[PDB]
A paper describes a structure:
The interaction between NOT1 and CAF1/POP2 connects the NOT module to the catalytic module and thus is central to the assembly of the CCR4–NOT complex. The structures reveal that the CAF1-binding domain of NOT1 adopts an MIF4G fold; thus, this domain was termed the NOT1 MIF4G domain. CAF1 (i.e. CNOT7) and POP2 (i.e. CNOT8) are one-domain proteins that adopt an RNase D-like fold.
The structure of the isolated MIF4G domain of NOT1 was solved by molecular replacement using NOT1 coordinates from the NOT1–CAF1 complex as the search model. The crystallographic asymmetric unit contains six monomers that superimpose to the NOT1 chains in the complex with RMSDs of <0.7 Å, indicating that the NOT1 structure is not altered upon binding to CAF1. The HEAT-like repeats are followed by a C-terminal extension that wraps around α-helices α9 and α7 in a structurally conserved manner, independent of crystal contacts. A superposition of the NOT1 MIF4G domain with the third MIF4G domain of UPF2 yields an RMSD value of 2.8 Å, calculated from the positions of 190 alignable Cα atoms, despite a very low sequence identity (<8%). The most notable difference between the MIF4G domains of NOT1 and UPF2 is that the C-terminal extension of NOT1 is replaced by an additional helix (α-helix 11) in UPF2.
Numbering used by the authors: -9 to 0, 1093 to 1317
Amino acid sequence: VLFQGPHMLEENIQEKIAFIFNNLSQSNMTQKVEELKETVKEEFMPWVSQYLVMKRVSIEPNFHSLYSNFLDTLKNPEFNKMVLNETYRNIKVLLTSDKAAANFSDRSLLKNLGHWLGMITLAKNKPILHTDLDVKSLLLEAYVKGQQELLYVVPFVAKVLESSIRSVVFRPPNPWTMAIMNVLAELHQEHDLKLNLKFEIEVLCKNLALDINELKPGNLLKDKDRLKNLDEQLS
């Protein structure tokens, strides 16, 4: 379904996969799950993964609970990792892309993918490995590159951390979750940071049932030695 070629029109595999996820509901879910297994070869699941993440998930955050339930009913761990790896691939296209304040779509895509990321990782009690994505280092990197990168990253990080509440492990006061919240707390009390991002962080705090003044900012934004030698995840 990515780069759909000439031979895939007659049978229209994308048009067939699309029939599964559109008009999907809690009512017809078990019917759609069995239909996916019945009408689509197991060899084609990578393409199904690509269609789900890219064509649906990235522009339908209202449907993420439904799609996450789809994965649950499907019970295909191999397909779940396809989706996860495909989720990381899409996140990186946006992270490594060239940023502007003028393009809103790319930021909404990045957020929705972040929200989805947390719903299939944190909320399912599975960690976001730093080999795939280093969240805390992402914030530190966004700080040195300027407001343009911060505008992309901060709401993105907020959307993935929102799922820690529905997690049994990643809820506060998880050392991993709180380590990130402390860096955001550090960014919050920076005269440089725009007001909307300061507001974004406060919204996130209450969304995690936290008092932003009970957080414990460190001195990571002043560690210029650590700031320069970051493994870059942005452009």
